[PDB]
Amino acid sequence: GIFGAIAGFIENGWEGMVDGWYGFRHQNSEGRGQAADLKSTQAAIDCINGKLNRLIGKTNEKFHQIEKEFSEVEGRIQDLEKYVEDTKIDLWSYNAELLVALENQHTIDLTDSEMNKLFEKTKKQLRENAEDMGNGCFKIYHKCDNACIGSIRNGTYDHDVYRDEALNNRFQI
Amino acid sequence: GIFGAIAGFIENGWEGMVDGWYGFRHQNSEGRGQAADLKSTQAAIDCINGKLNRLIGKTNEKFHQIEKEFSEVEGRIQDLEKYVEDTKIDLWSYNAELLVALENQHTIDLTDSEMNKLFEKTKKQLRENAEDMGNGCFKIYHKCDNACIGSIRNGTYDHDVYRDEALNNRFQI
Amino acid sequence: GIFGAIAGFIENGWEGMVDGWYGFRHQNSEGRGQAADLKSTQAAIDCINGKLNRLIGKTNEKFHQIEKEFSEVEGRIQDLEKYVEDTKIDLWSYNAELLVALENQHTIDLTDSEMNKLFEKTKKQLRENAEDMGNGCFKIYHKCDNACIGSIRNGTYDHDVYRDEALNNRFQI
Amino acid sequence: QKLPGNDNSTATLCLGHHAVPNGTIVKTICNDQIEVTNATELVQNSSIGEICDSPHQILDGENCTLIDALLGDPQCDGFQNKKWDLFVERSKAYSNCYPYDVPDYASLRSLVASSGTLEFNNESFNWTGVTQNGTSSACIRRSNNSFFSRLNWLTQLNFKYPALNVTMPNNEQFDKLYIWGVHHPVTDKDQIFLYAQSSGRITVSTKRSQQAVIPNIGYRPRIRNIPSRISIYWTIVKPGDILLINSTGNLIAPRGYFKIRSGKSSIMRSDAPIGKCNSECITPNGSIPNDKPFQNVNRITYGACPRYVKQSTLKLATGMRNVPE
Amino acid sequence: QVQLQQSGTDLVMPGASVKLSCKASGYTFISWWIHWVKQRPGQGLEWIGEIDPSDSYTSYNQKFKGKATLTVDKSSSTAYMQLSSLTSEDSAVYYCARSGYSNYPFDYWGQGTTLPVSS
Amino acid sequence: QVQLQQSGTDLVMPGASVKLSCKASGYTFISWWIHWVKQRPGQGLEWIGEIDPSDSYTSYNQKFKGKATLTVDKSSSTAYMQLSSLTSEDSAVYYCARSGYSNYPFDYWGQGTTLPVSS
Amino acid sequence: QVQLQQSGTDLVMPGASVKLSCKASGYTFISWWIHWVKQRPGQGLEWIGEIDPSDSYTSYNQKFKGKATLTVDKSSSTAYMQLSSLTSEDSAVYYCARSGYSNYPFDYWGQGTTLPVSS
Ligand SMILES: *[C@@H]1O[C@H](CO)[C@@H](O[C@@H]2O[C@H](CO)[C@@H](O[C@@H]3O[C@H](CO[C@H]4O[C@H](CO)[C@@H](O)[C@H](O)[C@@H]4O)[C@@H](O)[C@H](O[C@H]4O[C@H](CO)[C@@H](O)[C@H](O)[C@@H]4O)[C@@H]3O)[C@H](O)[C@H]2NC(C)=O)[C@H](O)[C@H]1NC(C)=O
Ligand SMILES: *[C@@H]1O[C@H](CO)[C@@H](O)[C@H](O)[C@H]1NC(C)=O
Ligand SMILES: *[C@@H]1O[C@H](CO)[C@@H](O)[C@H](O)[C@H]1NC(C)=O
Ligand SMILES: *[C@@H]1O[C@H](CO)[C@@H](O)[C@H](O)[C@H]1NC(C)=O
Ligand SMILES: *[C@@H]1O[C@H](CO)[C@@H](O)[C@H](O)[C@H]1NC(C)=O
Ligand SMILES: *[C@@H]1O[C@H](CO)[C@@H](O)[C@H](O)[C@H]1NC(C)=O
Ligand SMILES: *[C@@H]1O[C@H](CO)[C@@H](O)[C@H](O)[C@H]1NC(C)=O
């Protein structure tokens, strides 16, 4: 979590987002509304399932090996076989622990990156028509923020016909 | 991938922090001052101490093993024991090198991320009342009686009366 | 930890950047032109070549080892030797795969981070002189010829002599 | 995300994430206990409890060992000419024939399990002047005194034991495993009565190896009322080599070759019952699903199996970080 | 599991006021919205209004504007819906439903409270 | 490999107009700029103009402002010069050059189209 | 090791000006602030002024406004103090103190320079 979004300026998550992983939520004149962002959610699912295809399955076939349980005491060969098996088990346990920790850290960093990417994409779409309040929300200044000129935050925000900086963006009380 | 603060935009370090790792340093009409930020310092200290907790004190008990030094010269069994020990030593040396490099890279990334997160938190707190000078400082366009400098650091800073005055100072001539 | 630059707001790479890896490109009243950025390119080249130093060239000397191919069929010792060699090969293959994946991910994150850092540096150079168009180009709202374009590419930016001309066109126009 | 009170000139658009309630704790490199929305288990904790034989030709050893089935134990006569991919030896296994002790038991068991077949071809060996098919009271087959079915106990004939000298070349295109042995009598009187000579000597040699053994006459603790032992040796004859078995006494003569090969067979020590599945991996506890990368059931595996680790659980972060409330 | 416990049957005189209840259990009451649907025996389902338990956000249907008022009790995890000036047309089965947000589908429904408005 | 195919020799009467061609192959035509150089037998190389195949950006030399017009065909990957009012001073070898952008060296050149303006 | 070497003892006539010295060694001089504390033989410690060696930023006490003048020499790593118009009340021990910043504590102190102002 290095981008500081999921535990940063977003104070808490949203229980009830049952369709997507990242989304938009608003309260304009036409009432409250929520939508999910398919692109960032799909990218996160794509990378996590790439990890899942790397890990789940792909098991090497080991048919004949050495004896790993001994019912008697022999000496040199018994000690060597036990040492080899213990070395292999310790090395693979370290590999498993390091892989799990590194991939969990990368998953959390990827989630933080996707949240910050969606936030910055919305900020660059809005330009000077909105101010970031630091809660992850965007105070949008013109009219009809996400009902009729705000379903177009799929990539088609005009941000020119609603250059309303005189209302409250640059105004004196 | 590092962020651009620790060695980039934050130019040359400060050396005056004897209590914290990250913090603020201002110049108001009441004079200059320095103060540390406990939250980012504590987060970096927590992750670094966790990385130390994975390593310091956690050792595996290996009581009986194979012989690793041979006074006499022998054939297959001695060669196999030497090969097994050399393989284990080389694998653990590679694991140690990779672990040290990965944790050092992640510590540098974490410190860079924490400095950038504190800068972005301050930028989001200041809203349109302050400007990014590129040196890492914030040209705050409203005077204060050090109460604003106190309220920015803990997190209780609002636009207050210092919004119209800040906008008038920003947009002149 | 994708910063969302190489595949984000920068839509495509520039086939034609024959020197350097990152660069600028302007559109003035004196015509079009573009040039590379030496610092970010050199930093990315330095990290990638450092990975190349730690990978290419450094090899361990293994003179005498155990037999790895067997023509006859003895049991206990040849099966421990085959098991030891198979264990070493599997561990080193896993190490190679994890190393290649981690270094490739770090290289991609680094090359995204350098582009994002250079973008943020040239964004902080022009405080209210340019706006983020979100495609990677900045709408700079003043008469800028090749002298000030190269000043922005240079680090000798003034951002004060053009501030009035870039503040009238930014708001009133 | 405290939204303002809906002023009809300016309002807000907020961003958020998933945060399913009461997710799963995973481990990272900064935090040892961080909560995420979803996580998968990467360590196979438990098996189904039984071995089962869809992809692999699992052969239940029952109360028979692999070496006993190789030698031809009367209780293991049902394993003759039987192929397998995994011989599951049971802890209830025992021997009900003449006592024996292979000097390289682990190596012989490993090579026979790697060959993975018990198919046996009889050869018309030229034993002249001796008595074949020696029987013992401790080896009972259909309520009669018998012996190992794949081993020929050769004794005296008319108080004479001519010096054996035979030859069976490997004119085939495969290796020939000859299982033989030396009988260790209990007394010099018993050795004289059995083989007409005070001391025996067996030299089973090929074109690249020789094996010379000496019987060790002496008393031993009684197993099945037998104070004698038979140490079992083996010889592998490559194509083009010649098996020369020459002896003057105490020979447990072979009956043919066992057709060792190379493949994917092994041996397991287990007590799980055999059922029906479709499972690639077999552990001594039982078959496990090989969908998880790791396991903690057993270090002994057969087939496409997860790697054994010492960890009990390893939660891979399948979802995002869970920030409730 | 998620349950929305509702009253069974309330006998209310015509022209009076009733305050229905819908106890929420098995989930966090704050983070999930609560709706109200009225179903007549001779008509289909009719959405009345919605409430946000976090800050008591109200937005009703145009038909049921002065008829219904939606309130919540975060301490007892119960959502109320007060009916005013009950007539013969108000005699129907009322359902409380948990959706997830305003424009999200109703995940779990209540048992339904039959309200016979008769003398 | 990358080539810039051109016509060999065109015989044009004086006072007429010609449309030279420079077929581009072996590379992405949009991503790389196309320039134009004229070389007289008694003079040095002279840069005429440049074209951006992405959006047809034109910037000509001051001496060749009213003489040459640069156009591209994105379908056939060809670049054209529309020479107007050819005189005796226009008899030279014309090269088309691929650079990469406006301020970059000409990576690959054409074969050279000789244009003898005579009767 | 870090230390602040000072002059031993200066015998200065009353009504004259003195320039005390505090040589800094063992640390980077420009990255640490230097303060000045006066201790009367009967009274306690009294802060006078602070200096930032990076840019010679000055901020003195209200009482010691026209008395003290703090200067630094980055070449010789010495911090001076131009005391002017010495009187009978100026005869005290003067200390120089290293600091992280203005509000950061006095990390290391000098040996102290006794200044007997007598005739
Ligand atoms: C060198 O030293 C070794 C020491 O190990 C001696 O070996 C032992 O010799 C004795 C004597 O022969 C053996 O004892 C015999 O055991 C047989 C097996 O016992 C099992 O079966 C019977 C039923 O048949 C059960 O009752 C019993 O509980 C066991 O389960 C017995 O069958 C033998 O019985 C014979 O003798 C008795 C009289 O004592 C008769 O009544 C019987 O009918 C029968 O004829 C006998 O008891 C012993 O097993 C040997 N091994 C061990 C490990 O002790 C050598 O004998 C010795 N050699 C010399 C030359 O001194
Ligand atoms: C700043 O934070 C402190 C806690 O460290 C606390 O006194 C309060 O929240 C803030 N100060 C003031 C004066 O409000
Ligand atoms: C660019 O910078 C260099 C050195 O920093 C110097 O030539 C000058 O300041 C700048 N030149 C131009 C042409 O902007
Ligand atoms: C998870 O936590 C919730 C309360 O937040 C609780 O109601 C639920 O029973 C928990 N789940 C399990 C499986 O215990
Ligand atoms: C050995 O196995 C056979 C068949 O599986 C069984 O009939 C016999 O009882 C077993 N022997 C013992 C001692 O249980
Ligand atoms: C067996 O050996 C005898 C030796 O007397 C010999 O005469 C006979 O031909 C041999 N038979 C075979 C099949 O080798
Ligand atoms: C010995 O027994 C085998 C059966 O395994 C039989 O084929 C052979 O003829 C017998 N030999 C004699 C001499 O009885």
CSV table of C-alpha atoms in Angstrom, one decimal, chain A residues 16-170:
chain,number,residue,atom,x,y,z
A,16,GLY,CA,-22.6,-2.7,-1.0
A,17,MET,CA,-20.4,-2.5,-4.1
A,18,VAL,CA,-21.6,-5.9,-5.2
A,19,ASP,CA,-20.7,-5.7,-9.0
A,20,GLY,CA,-17.3,-4.1,-9.2
A,21,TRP,CA,-14.1,-3.4,-7.2
A,22,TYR,CA,-13.7,0.3,-7.8
A,23,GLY,CA,-16.5,2.7,-8.5
A,24,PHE,CA,-18.1,6.2,-8.4
A,25,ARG,CA,-20.7,7.6,-6.0
A,26,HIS,CA,-22.4,11.0,-5.9
A,27,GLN,CA,-25.2,13.2,-4.6
A,28,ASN,CA,-26.4,15.7,-7.1
A,29,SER,CA,-29.8,17.4,-7.6
A,30,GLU,CA,-31.3,14.3,-9.2
A,31,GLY,CA,-30.5,12.1,-6.1
A,32,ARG,CA,-27.8,9.8,-5.0
A,33,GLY,CA,-26.3,7.2,-7.4
A,34,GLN,CA,-23.6,4.6,-7.7
A,35,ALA,CA,-21.8,3.0,-10.6
A,36,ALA,CA,-18.8,0.6,-10.9
A,37,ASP,CA,-15.7,1.1,-12.9
A,38,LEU,CA,-15.2,-1.9,-15.1
A,39,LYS,CA,-11.7,-1.1,-16.5
A,40,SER,CA,-9.8,-0.9,-13.2
A,41,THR,CA,-11.7,-3.8,-11.6
A,42,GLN,CA,-11.0,-5.9,-14.7
A,43,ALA,CA,-7.3,-5.0,-14.6
A,44,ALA,CA,-7.0,-5.9,-11.0
A,45,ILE,CA,-8.8,-9.2,-11.6
A,46,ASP,CA,-6.6,-9.8,-14.6
A,47,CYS,CA,-3.3,-9.5,-12.7
A,48,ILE,CA,-4.6,-11.5,-9.7
A,49,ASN,CA,-5.8,-14.3,-12.0
A,50,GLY,CA,-2.5,-14.2,-13.7
A,51,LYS,CA,-0.9,-14.9,-10.3
A,52,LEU,CA,-3.6,-17.6,-9.9
A,53,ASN,CA,-2.8,-19.3,-13.2
A,54,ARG,CA,0.9,-19.2,-12.2
A,55,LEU,CA,0.3,-20.8,-8.8
A,56,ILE,CA,-2.9,-23.0,-9.1
A,57,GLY,CA,-1.9,-26.0,-11.2
A,58,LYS,CA,1.5,-26.5,-12.9
A,59,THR,CA,2.7,-29.3,-10.5
A,60,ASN,CA,5.8,-31.2,-11.4
A,61,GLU,CA,5.6,-35.0,-11.6
A,62,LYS,CA,7.9,-36.8,-9.2
A,63,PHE,CA,7.4,-40.5,-9.5
A,64,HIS,CA,10.4,-42.2,-7.9
A,65,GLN,CA,12.4,-40.6,-5.2
A,66,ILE,CA,14.4,-41.5,-2.1
A,67,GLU,CA,13.0,-43.0,1.1
A,68,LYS,CA,12.0,-40.3,3.5
A,69,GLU,CA,10.9,-42.4,6.5
A,70,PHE,CA,13.3,-44.9,8.1
A,71,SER,CA,12.3,-47.6,10.6
A,72,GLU,CA,15.9,-48.5,11.6
A,73,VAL,CA,19.3,-46.9,12.2
A,74,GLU,CA,22.0,-47.3,9.5
A,75,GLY,CA,24.3,-44.3,9.7
A,76,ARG,CA,25.9,-42.3,6.9
A,77,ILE,CA,23.4,-42.9,4.1
A,78,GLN,CA,20.4,-42.4,6.5
A,79,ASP,CA,21.9,-39.1,7.8
A,80,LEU,CA,22.7,-37.9,4.3
A,81,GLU,CA,19.2,-38.7,3.0
A,82,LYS,CA,17.5,-37.0,6.0
A,83,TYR,CA,19.8,-34.0,5.6
A,84,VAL,CA,19.0,-33.7,1.9
A,85,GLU,CA,15.2,-34.0,2.5
A,86,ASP,CA,15.4,-31.5,5.4
A,87,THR,CA,17.4,-29.1,3.2
A,88,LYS,CA,14.8,-29.4,0.4
A,89,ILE,CA,11.9,-28.9,2.7
A,90,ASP,CA,13.5,-25.8,4.4
A,91,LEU,CA,14.4,-24.3,1.1
A,92,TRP,CA,10.9,-24.8,-0.4
A,93,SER,CA,9.3,-23.5,2.8
A,94,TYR,CA,11.4,-20.4,2.6
A,95,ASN,CA,10.5,-20.1,-1.1
A,96,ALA,CA,6.8,-20.5,-0.3
A,97,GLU,CA,6.9,-17.9,2.5
A,98,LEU,CA,8.8,-15.4,0.4
A,99,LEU,CA,6.6,-15.9,-2.6
A,100,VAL,CA,3.4,-15.5,-0.6
A,101,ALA,CA,4.7,-12.4,1.2
A,102,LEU,CA,6.0,-10.7,-2.0
A,103,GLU,CA,2.8,-11.5,-4.0
A,104,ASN,CA,0.6,-10.2,-1.2
A,105,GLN,CA,2.6,-7.0,-1.0
A,106,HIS,CA,2.4,-6.7,-4.8
A,107,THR,CA,-1.3,-7.3,-4.8
A,108,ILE,CA,-1.9,-4.6,-2.2
A,109,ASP,CA,0.4,-2.2,-4.0
A,110,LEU,CA,-1.4,-3.0,-7.3
A,111,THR,CA,-4.8,-2.2,-5.6
A,112,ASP,CA,-3.4,1.1,-4.3
A,113,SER,CA,-2.1,1.9,-7.7
A,114,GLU,CA,-5.4,1.1,-9.4
A,115,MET,CA,-7.3,3.3,-6.9
A,116,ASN,CA,-4.9,6.1,-7.4
A,117,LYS,CA,-5.0,5.7,-11.2
A,118,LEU,CA,-8.8,6.0,-11.2
A,119,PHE,CA,-8.6,9.0,-8.9
A,120,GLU,CA,-6.0,10.7,-11.1
A,121,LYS,CA,-7.9,9.9,-14.3
A,122,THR,CA,-11.0,11.5,-12.9
A,123,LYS,CA,-9.0,14.5,-11.7
A,124,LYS,CA,-7.4,14.9,-15.1
A,125,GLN,CA,-10.9,14.5,-16.8
A,126,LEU,CA,-12.3,17.2,-14.5
A,127,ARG,CA,-9.4,19.7,-14.9
A,128,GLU,CA,-10.4,23.1,-13.4
A,129,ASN,CA,-14.1,22.3,-13.1
A,130,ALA,CA,-13.7,20.4,-9.8
A,131,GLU,CA,-11.6,20.6,-6.6
A,132,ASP,CA,-10.3,17.6,-4.7
A,133,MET,CA,-11.5,17.8,-1.0
A,134,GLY,CA,-8.9,15.3,0.3
A,135,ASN,CA,-11.6,12.7,1.1
A,136,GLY,CA,-11.3,11.2,-2.4
A,137,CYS,CA,-14.3,13.1,-3.5
A,138,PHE,CA,-14.5,15.8,-6.2
A,139,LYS,CA,-16.5,19.0,-5.5
A,140,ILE,CA,-17.9,19.5,-9.1
A,141,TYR,CA,-19.0,23.1,-9.5
A,142,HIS,CA,-21.3,23.6,-12.6
A,143,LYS,CA,-24.6,21.5,-12.6
A,144,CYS,CA,-25.8,17.9,-13.0
A,145,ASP,CA,-22.6,16.4,-11.7
A,146,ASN,CA,-23.4,12.7,-12.3
A,147,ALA,CA,-26.9,12.4,-13.7
A,148,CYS,CA,-26.9,13.9,-17.2
A,149,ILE,CA,-23.4,15.3,-17.8
A,150,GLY,CA,-21.8,12.8,-15.5
A,151,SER,CA,-22.6,9.4,-17.0
A,152,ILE,CA,-19.9,10.6,-19.5
A,153,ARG,CA,-17.1,9.9,-17.0
A,154,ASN,CA,-16.4,6.8,-19.0
A,155,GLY,CA,-13.8,8.8,-21.1
A,156,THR,CA,-16.1,11.3,-22.8
A,157,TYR,CA,-16.3,14.3,-20.4
A,158,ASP,CA,-16.4,17.5,-22.4
A,159,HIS,CA,-14.9,19.8,-19.7
A,160,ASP,CA,-15.3,22.8,-22.0
A,161,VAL,CA,-19.0,23.7,-22.2
A,162,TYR,CA,-19.1,23.5,-18.3
A,163,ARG,CA,-16.2,25.8,-17.6
A,164,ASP,CA,-18.0,27.2,-14.6
A,165,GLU,CA,-15.3,28.8,-12.5
A,166,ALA,CA,-17.3,31.9,-11.5
A,167,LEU,CA,-19.9,30.1,-9.4
A,168,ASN,CA,-17.8,28.9,-6.5
A,169,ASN,CA,-14.4,27.8,-7.9
A,170,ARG,CA,-13.0,31.4,-8.0
